Amino acid sequence: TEESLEGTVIYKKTTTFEVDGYTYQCDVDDGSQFVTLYNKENKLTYEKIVYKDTGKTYIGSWSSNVIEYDRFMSQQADFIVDQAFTKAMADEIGKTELMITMLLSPNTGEVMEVNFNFFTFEPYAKVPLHVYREIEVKLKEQIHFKPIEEGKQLNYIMLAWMQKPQGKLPPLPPPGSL
Amino acid sequence: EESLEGTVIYKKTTTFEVDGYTYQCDVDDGSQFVTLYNKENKLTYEKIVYKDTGKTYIGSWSSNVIEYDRFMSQQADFIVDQAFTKAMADEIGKTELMITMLLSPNTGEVMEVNFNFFTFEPYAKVPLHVYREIEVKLKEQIHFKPIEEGKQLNYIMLAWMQKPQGK
Numbered sequence A: 001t002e003e004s005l006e007g008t009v010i011y012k013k014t015t016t017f018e019v020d021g022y023t024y025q026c027d028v029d030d031g032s033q034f035v036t037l038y039n040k041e042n043k044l045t046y047e048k049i050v051y052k053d054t055g056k057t058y059i060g061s062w063s064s065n066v067i068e069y070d071r072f073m074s075q076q077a078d079f080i081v082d083q084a085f086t087k088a089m090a091d092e093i094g095k096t097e098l099m100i101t102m103l104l105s106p107n108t109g110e111v112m113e114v115n116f117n118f119f120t121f122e123p124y125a126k127v128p129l130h131v132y133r134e135i136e137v138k139l140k141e142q143i144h145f146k147p148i149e150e151g152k153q154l155n156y157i158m159l160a161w162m163q164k165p166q167g168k169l170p171p172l173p174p175p176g177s178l
Numbered sequence B: 001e002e003s004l005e006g007t008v009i010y011k012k013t014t015t016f017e018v019d020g021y022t023y024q025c026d027v028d029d030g031s032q033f034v035t036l037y038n039k040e041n042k043l044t045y046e047k048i049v050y051k052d053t054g055k056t057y058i059g060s061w062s063s064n065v066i067e068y069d070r071f072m073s074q075q076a077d078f079i080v081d082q083a084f085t086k087a088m089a090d091e092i093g094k095t096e097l098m099i100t101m102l103l104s105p106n107t108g109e110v111m112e113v114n115f116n117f118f119t120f121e122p123y124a125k126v127p128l129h130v131y132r133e134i135e136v137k138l139k140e141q142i143h144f145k146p147i148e149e150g151k152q153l154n155y156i157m158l159a160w161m162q163k164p165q166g167k
Helices: A071-085 A087-093 A129-142 A147-154 B069-084 B085-092 B130-142 B148-152
Strands: A015-019 A022-029 A033-038 A098-104 A111-119 A157-163 B014-018 B021-028 B033-038 B097-103 B111-116 B156-162
Touching: A015 A098, A015 A129, A033 A129, A071 A098, A098 A129, A098 B014, A111 A129, A147 B130, B021 B148, B033 B130, B069 B097, B069 B130, B069 B156, B097 B130, B111 B130
Parallel strands: none
Antiparallel strands: A015 A022, A022 A033, A033 A111, A098 A111, A098 A157, B014 B021, B021 B033, B033 B111, B097 B111, B097 B156
16 A cells, blocks of 8 residues: 555566466557557457448447446546555656556447556556556456447447546445345 | 364344344345345444545545554454464465454544455354354454544545454
């Protein structure tokens, strides 16, 4: 809980990180210094979102056209991201935001893959790999949304958002069923 | 040498009346998220707000609610650790329990405690007396001084994630 950012940039160029139990790929565009960080087992990182029946591109933007809104699950995803960072990291990060992407099954709405985007000149580029791994694992374990409307027809459902860790309280729990 | 139970205890919304206390287990069927609490608790679903305005308090590392007390935080962690046996802790693995203490913004005493986990996690096989013990001990032993924004809230929420080490 007192672990901080590392002193030097970890994700500086295209690299593979083989750690105990998992491998992450770090892809860096040299001109923009934009980083795409993902479990190397992921297959959909650069895949086009299409209607699976036809291969035609899906170009909607409103999430209610692909998933049923769920307040708790949405806030829990935000909480998982926020809670992975210590106060020391969050204080060093300041106002800069991380991009997180969850790729959902269009059948079950479960999180199949997670990936991260940020720039090498941002504080996210000094965040220890185990933080990103923890986010990936927890999102995959806990989060799902019901596919609806066009979402049921896609190859996958992409939920990408910008967030900064700030030390938020956990969400109010959903009420008990029955 | 008590271990986790063989089947999930907290599978659906249920009231557990045992000799000496009653716990409510609320389970959201879609998420399989469990909220486990003493049925006498009233604040489990109460929004934390600034009492003067009713505006929601989101929580932030930049907003102090209590005076930092390392030793008191260590006692809270010790209570949670010691309530589990080594056998339970070994079966639980890396998964963490969420514990929430709700404090008086006046006295900083722990008014209520509740627990959260998912039905598919090992915490859903932890005997009820473990949670009861944690609740009782936190309420009697743990207190913090409210300061700054904490004095302005309806209640102070201290929530954390912990994997028990076991007695």
